[PDB]
């Protein structure tokens, strides 16, 4: 169907009455397509709450993770909410909001496998393209091979199939994958490889929208909306401390 690409200021957005939100749709329980193929998750609930507070109809676009920030800067959407940890490198190309959650990257292996970064000496480590996991895997010494996947759930599948020794992913993502697939007795979560603060992105320089997102997120944090949505997905409050 195609769409009109434009980096829009908040005033232009407000004038149209709708806001375009980019996400991935392959990172359960943050953003994913459910069993009746509808987009949902923590970040989808958060984005819709933000849109509602701002008085705007949300329009969601799911696309592959590796080009979300690319297509954001090209004008495909107004902001992205797709679990991006804030990094110096990414901040050169997009502006981040205040983080909407805090989390960490974690080692996951089959029951007898690697627990610590040092255990990764000589091992095959699967990670998703363009992630902070692939960043940290490239910097852990003595890994035999970093295998990079287009989608995070496919790295998990290669771990289950015994084609890699370890999968590095988000701690909440690993937690829920194991539960929902009943792999408590087959997978083992190891140590936290790093910690990160995860934020929404807008196109480099889009301060007016950045301001409006930061104001809405603060209100959701203060008025109880954030707390309900976090409790809904995690049974705990995941905001940054």
**Which stretches of the chain bind ligand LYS, using CB under 6 A?**
24, 27, 65, 83-85, 128, 131-132, 152, 170, 198
**Which value, to the nearest 10 degrees, does the dihedral of the CA atoms of residues 113, 115, 116, 117 take?**
40
Closest CB to ligand LYS among residues 169, 206? 169
Do the strands 187-203 and 26-27 form a parallel or antiparallel pair, or are they unpaired? unpaired
Measured from the CB of residue 37, what is the shortest distance to ligand LYS in angstroms? 19
Closest CB to ligand LYS among residues 156, 220? 156
Measured from the CB of residue 198, what is the shortest distance to ligand LYS in angstroms? 6
Closest CB to ligand LYS among residues 45, 170? 170
Closest CB to ligand LYS among residues 131, 230? 131
Q: What DSSP element (H or E) covers 201?
A: strand 187-203
Measured from the CB of residue 220, what is the shortest distance to ligand LYS in angstroms? 20
Residue number of the CB closest to ligand LYS reads: 131
Query: Using alpha carbons only, what angle is made at residue 80 by residues 75 and 85, rounded to the nearest 5 degrees?
Result: 130
What residues contact 99, with CB distance under 8 A and at least 6 apart? 86, 197, 198, 199, 240
Measured from the CB of residue 78, what is the shortest distance to ligand LYS in angstroms? 19
């Amino acid at each position: 169907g195609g769409s009109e690409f434009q980096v829009r200021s908040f005033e232009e957005i407000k004038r149209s009455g709708e806001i375009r939100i980019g996400t991935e749709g392959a990172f359960p329980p943050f953003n994913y397509f459910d069993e009746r193929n509808q987009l949902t998750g923590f970040e989808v609930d958060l984005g819709n709450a933000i849109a509602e507070r701002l008085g705007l109809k949300p329009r969601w676009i799911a696309q592959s993770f590796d080009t979300l920030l690319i297509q954001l800067n090209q004008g495909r959407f107004d902001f992205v909410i797709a679990s991006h940890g804030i990094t110096e490198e990414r901040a050169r190309a997009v502006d981040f909001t205040n983080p909407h959650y805090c989390t960490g990257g974690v080692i996951v292996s089959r029951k007898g496998g690697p627990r610590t970064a040092k255990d990764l000496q000589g091992k095959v480590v699967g990670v998703q393209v363009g992630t902070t996991y692939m960043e940290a895997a490239q910097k852990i010494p003595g890994i035999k091979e970093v295998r990079t996947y287009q989608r995070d759930p496919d790295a998990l599948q290669d771990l289950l199939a015994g084609r890699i020794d370890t999968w590095i992913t988000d701690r909440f993502v690993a937690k829920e994958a194991i539960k929902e697939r009943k792999l408590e007795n087959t997978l083992q979560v190891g140590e936290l490889v790093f910690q990160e603060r995860v934020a929404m992105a807008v196109a480099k320089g889009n301060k007016s929208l950045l301001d409006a997102l930061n104001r809405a997120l603060a209100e959701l944090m203060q008025d109880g909306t954030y707390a309900r949505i976090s409790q809904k997905w995690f049974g705990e409050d995941v905001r940054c401390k």
